[PDB]
Amino acid sequence: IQTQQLHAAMADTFLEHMCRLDIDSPPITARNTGIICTIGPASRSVETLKEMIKSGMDVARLNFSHGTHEYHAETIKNVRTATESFASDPILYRPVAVALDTKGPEIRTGLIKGSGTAEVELKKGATLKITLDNAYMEKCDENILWLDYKNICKVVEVGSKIYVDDGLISLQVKQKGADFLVTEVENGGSLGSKKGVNLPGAAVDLPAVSEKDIQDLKFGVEQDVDMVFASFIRKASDVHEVRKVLGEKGKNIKIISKIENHEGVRRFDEILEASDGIMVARGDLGIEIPAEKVFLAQKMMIGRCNRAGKPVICATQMLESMIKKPRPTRAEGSDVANAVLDGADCIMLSGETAKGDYPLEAVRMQHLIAREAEAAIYHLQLFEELRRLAPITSDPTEATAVGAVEASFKCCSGAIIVLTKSGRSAHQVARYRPRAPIIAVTRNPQTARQAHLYRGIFPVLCKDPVQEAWAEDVDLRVNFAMNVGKARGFFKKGDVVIVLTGWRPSGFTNTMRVVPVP
Amino acid sequence: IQTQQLHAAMADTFLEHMCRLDIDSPPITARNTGIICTIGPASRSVETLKEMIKSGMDVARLNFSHGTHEYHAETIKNVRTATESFASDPILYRPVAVALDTKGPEIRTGLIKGSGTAEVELKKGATLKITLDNAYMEKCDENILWLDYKNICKVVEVGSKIYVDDGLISLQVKQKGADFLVTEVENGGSLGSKKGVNLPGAAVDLPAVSEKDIQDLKFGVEQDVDMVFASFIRKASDVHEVRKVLGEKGKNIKIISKIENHEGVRRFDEILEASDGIMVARGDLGIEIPAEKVFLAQKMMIGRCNRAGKPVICATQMLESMIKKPRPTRAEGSDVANAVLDGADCIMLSGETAKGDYPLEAVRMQHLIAREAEAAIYHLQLFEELRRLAPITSDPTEATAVGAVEASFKCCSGAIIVLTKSGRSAHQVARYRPRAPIIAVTRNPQTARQAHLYRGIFPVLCKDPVQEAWAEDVDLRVNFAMNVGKARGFFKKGDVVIVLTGWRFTNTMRVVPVP
Amino acid sequence: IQTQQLHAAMADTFLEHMCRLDIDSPPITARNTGIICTIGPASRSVETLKEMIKSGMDVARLNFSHGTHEYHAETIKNVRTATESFASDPILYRPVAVALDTKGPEIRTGLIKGGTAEVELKKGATLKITLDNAYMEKCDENILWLDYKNICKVVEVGSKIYVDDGLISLQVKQKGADFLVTEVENGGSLGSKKGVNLPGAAVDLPAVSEKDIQDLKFGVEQDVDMVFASFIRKASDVHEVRKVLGEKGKNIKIISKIENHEGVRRFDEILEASDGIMVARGDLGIEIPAEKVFLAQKMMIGRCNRAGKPVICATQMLESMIKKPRPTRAEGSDVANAVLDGADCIMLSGETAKGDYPLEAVRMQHLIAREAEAAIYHLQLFEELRRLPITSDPTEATAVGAVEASFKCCSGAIIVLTKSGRSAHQVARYRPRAPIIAVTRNPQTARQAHLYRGIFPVLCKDPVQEAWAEDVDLRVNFAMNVGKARGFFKKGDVVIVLTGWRPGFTNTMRVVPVP
Ligand SMILES: O=C([O-])C(=O)[O-]
Ligand SMILES: O=C([O-])C(=O)[O-]
Ligand SMILES: O=C([O-])C(=O)[O-]
Ligand SMILES: [Mg+2]
Ligand SMILES: [Mg+2]
Ligand SMILES: [Mg+2]
């Protein structure tokens, strides 16, 4: 029995490729898909974070929809303490990125009357009056509901749908009153305090970057975060408002645009051009559009990002039941697998790691599934199509990278070793989706952390001083990657790896060697 | 914003096909993927079953792991009452099949000290002793657990892992004592009564068809069920035993083999050729094999069933969260869409329809998702592959079927209408996975009910008596299909459809306008 | 072994398709590529023409660059006598088409002085060219007359001039007041009334000369089936020919001959205006560098296949058979690769008009074309042809359904009932392996069907029936008998039958066993 689905890899049709997928064909040790973990009460402590990292966390996500700067500053410090606790052995050190997820133009309800911790029951068919009068902002109940978007009545009409609390409650407007927004409860259910509101289709006029988002983004610059997940990006100019707030100081912070409503889907191309990457934010997306269409937008966005060479993240509810249970549902297992099969660079955990009872188990499961799914990719067709859908180029670095990927398929390489200052050389390889892991050796700490955005890049940070004679410094960076691979089980002595290097001291990568492991 | 993802249909690469998927491209009205609903307390009533059918239920599954013959007989009559409640309008009548899912070689624990509602906590690292002694069968607690598999000790050894309650609790064998199988709790969890036990990697020597299974199968023959879902099929031998029990009286009942353990995957090809169809039984399968590997087995089995032209069902936890909530998670929506993309003929609901609070909404969600995913199939590549990975016939019906599918892709027709007595002609069309719905006109009611196992077949049961003129009896059945398709919104007057009939072998194809 | 290269037919790659081509896999009896023969002194006797027909000739080409109307009228008369000599058995009768190949804008030298002897032109020698008619019968090695009075306006010092199928080349050395002056580059025996090419000159001769008008109107009176229009440079040339043919000749097919650089460059607009194309490699290889002709041939055949219009590969396919009874290996290669390229027809000129082995050359083209037809990689060809979209047109959908079915059941033929030919043409455009037996009652339809690959046209002279169903079966049975007599299939084989249903067009396909 061959390993890593290599028998299905040789199938001449996609149908026969499926027929050959073999549960007794073990995957390789390396896992190429990045795992982004939302950090929260269940995962904040240094000790848990050390375990989170050992279980495979690549990026810590902080959701500024909730929490104070004090809280998030402590979280980040704990993330950094846990991460740096492994620095004592640079062979086994893994950089861990920090990601700031903005609140964005959220609409929220007020507090339920009383203590504010209660819920009230909305009954199917009942009337619910929405009010903007702040006298009710802490007096919400089943008859009068307050919410924080003051211009709501200007963007809805009789017949407009309104969803509350993750889309669990639906209302249809039946009167725009003088002091009222009168609705009927279409889907009833329990209503707590400060729940999310979606106005599907409505031209919501909240700013893309609010005064609160400006504070969080500046805070993110001060805290040296590696990326921003910008909530509710509707258009290319929304990305500009994030970018100008990040300013010159934040010029190297990646802006991942979160697509979560119909306008963002419709304007995806202009958004993708303006962004450093994309998040398929399926939570709001499946409220904003019919939930049965989310997989279309997911596959469209992943496909276009692979085509553009830009990082794409699949997010929200992929292991949801593991908030309460130690094992995932069969739908959750196949959802993680299919996100990798679609071509997602990273997958994400929100409540599973932020507040659930089984954060470590959830991280470990994404690790296990992604590694199985990575072997089950039909590389033959994928690589054929990525080359064909790619231009011809005067760029030798492009030609070197595609040559390296092609060679790595031919000799079933244990890795592709790339020396890179900015990441670009490693990113160029990853865009061709080799099956071998891409060990990117860099001395730039930010490059190393940001590399998790790209499928297959295993970033190793070299802290050794620069060697005189650049020939000797190229070696002992290759050798550093050789020792990481052996220590991690990616390959052993006598295996073949591919090594990408330049011709002199950034963008001079032009040399591929097919090199045995010493 | 075009229709039914036809822009994505035109793409020259799968990557560009993905890039072209369009949330503003609306699917056709017809939904090709069959929906199987497990019936239970939440869905047993004639009132609910009528709504189940209205929401899109095609097959009623009865799980004989639980319940009595008297109980199941009442469920079955309710299904037929609700189904026939629509039989007065043959233009809108939908056949509903009945499926019997056997118990099979299940292992169960006993009752917690007291009731079936009591639970105890099992703590990580604690000792738990398993007993086969019936003195303990109603005195299970945190130290002693009874299960009903009398021979378990001759099948495990020290170091073996034992899973309880959907694999949520795991134990490791530490000693094989004289009266007690003593284990250490590995995964802690609350343990109730009568929970399923799994023994991955053990040669479980329970009979494939037990004495309970025989009387359930004979009952199914008496009750005129359309198909059997046979649990824990491990080898072709097991299928033959089910077919033997069904006997001559049940020779037309379809046997779907449920693949839920390692041996059934390893022996899949021989199980498939012995079987009429396959169920990817993901619940147990995910406990028997590492859960991260299930999608491999799912795609392997769907691919091989597509290759063989046999029905395949994807089952278990597709919309699990809708047992308690009125909308699925995003993983659940994705799971359903991807099963259809994978090529499954049918998708299934178990707890969502049997006992949860939103059985109707779960059926409607599978209906909505399946239909969106059917349009998102990359038919260009799929039709090319099914043709190449298919033998050369000499069979005139096979050639007519593939030509009809080819023609239907060319003239983007509203349906393929086929007159079939046995179903075979429609099955041969469905095996090539046309985009267009297949309206199979039959007078055989069992053919009508069993047609749901095949993707795309909309069975319509002609109740008219036969006309003397065969040429006129053909037109009467064809025009009945035209009225069905117009009443249901599949196409309208002037649209183009494909019509498959015989010469008094289904061997003639007509491209005709809807009148 | 397998037959008709079916083992190579199911290869997954073109490379493996080549690897499986098998000299021991014999082809089917039917030959799909049309054979066009230039009728001339070696081939216009009634008795020879009978043997041409029996050897495989489908179209008689008459080259109006030479001969008088009276001479050509007799040739047409003899062709029709030979052809109708087989009408006494309607089952073995093959329609034979008559094609009129125009003179077009030719340039010709005058007569060698007497008495058509030849003079030797020597490399390096001087040769004066005159336009003075005083010299038109006194050409020799020193002075040569030609009939293009405006030649001095379109050439210059340095211009190259080619005489006698490009075998003799001259370079212009001065333009005198009278007598252009020239040096011989390639020497050779110069005979009388030889053809002249001026590659890259704006030769302003009319597309349709007064002589062409007479010849075209002669063609109408003689009821010819098609016109091969020489030296078509642009769409408006095609329009000129069509206008001269006018209303009386409106059913005559116009095949444009692509013979120079301008015709290649403007190919698309010429193809659009034309009924089909001839790759006139003789002139074309003088007008453009000979090493580029295969580029223009493959381009033109590819675009004609893409457009569904007939294309003829012509000139020097079996040249050495003018004098020897066997072709060279390049000639065998040339014919095969023309068929593999996709040519609807292949042509003979001197091999049949004036050579010593006209029958052997016809038979060689028949033998090669049939081997090459089996070697076509139909899997790729059909996939790619299909990939061009699904039009509402139900005749198109039926045609592609029939071709797909014919691949599936390896049918002995596709039988098509057609008045105008169109349904049969639509089938041929998808290039089935099986022969297409087009049953028509129109004799011109039957003769023009030869322009489309694979159409074996049969002329039904049985009377119409009042019962449409009976009239269909009569014509289908006639095609069955034709196929049985010709060895295409036999009792028990399977054929595909394309018909209309109650005439109102071709929307019915049946997969039918041969009785
Ligand atoms: O904000 C998110 O992550 C979402 O909606 O999925
Ligand atoms: O038996 C079943 O249905 C399962 O385990 O999924
Ligand atoms: O006219 C022709 O036959 C040629 O030039 O090949
Ligand atoms: Mg969101
Ligand atoms: Mg089970
Ligand atoms: Mg010529």
Numbering used by the authors:
A (entry chain C): 13 to 517, 519 to 531
B (entry chain B): 13 to 516, 521 to 531
C (entry chain A): 13 to 126, 128 to 401, 403 to 518, 521 to 531
Paper text:
Pyruvate kinase muscle isoform 2 (PKM2) is an essential glycolytic enzyme involved in cancer metabolism. It catalyzes the rate-limiting step of glycolysis by converting phosphoenolpyruvate (PEP) and adenosine diphosphate (ADP) to adenosine triphosphate (ATP). Tumors utilize PKM2 to fuel their growth and proliferation, and at a molecular level this function depends on the unique property of the enzyme to exist in an active tetramer and an inactive dimer/monomer form. In each PKM2 monomer, there are four domains, namely, N-(residues 1–44), A-(residues 44–116 and 219–389), B-(residues 117–218), and C-(residues 390–531) domains.
Specifically, N70, located near the AA binding site, was mutated to D (hereafter, PKM2 N70D) in order to break the interaction between the carboxylate oxygen of the AA ligand and sidechain -NH2 of N70. To gain insight into how mutation of specific residues in either end of β1 (N70D and N75) regulate the activity and oligomeric state differently from that of wtPKM2, the crystal structure of PKM2 N70D was determined. However, the B-domain in all four chains of PKM2 N70D aligned well with wtPKM2-FBP. The AA binding pocket of PKM2 N70D did not undergo significant structural changes by replacing the polar sidechain with an acidic group. While several studies have reported FBP to co-purify and co-crystallize with wtPKM2 even without adding it in the crystallization condition, in PKM2 N70D structure only a portion of unbound FBP molecule (comprising of the phosphate moiety) was present at an occupancy of ~0.7 in all four chains. Interestingly, significant movements of various residues occurred in the FBP-binding pocket of PKM2 N70D (right insets). In both chains C and D, the sidechain of R436 flips out and away from the FBP-binding site, thus breaking its contact with S434, which is involved in H-bond interaction with P2 phosphate of FBP (top inset). Finally, the sidechain of E396 located at the dimer-dimer interface swings away, breaking the H-bond with R399 (middle right inset). Thus the movement of key residues results in disruption of various electrostatic and H-bond interactions with FBP, leading to the eviction of FBP from its binding pocket, consequently perturbing the PKM2 N70D tetramer to a mixture of tetramer:dimer/monomer states. Taken together, the data effectively demonstrates that mutation of N70 breaks the flow of the inhibitory signal from the AA binding pocket to the active site without altering the binding of the AAs, thus confirming that N70 is involved in transmitting Val/Cys mediated inhibitory signals.
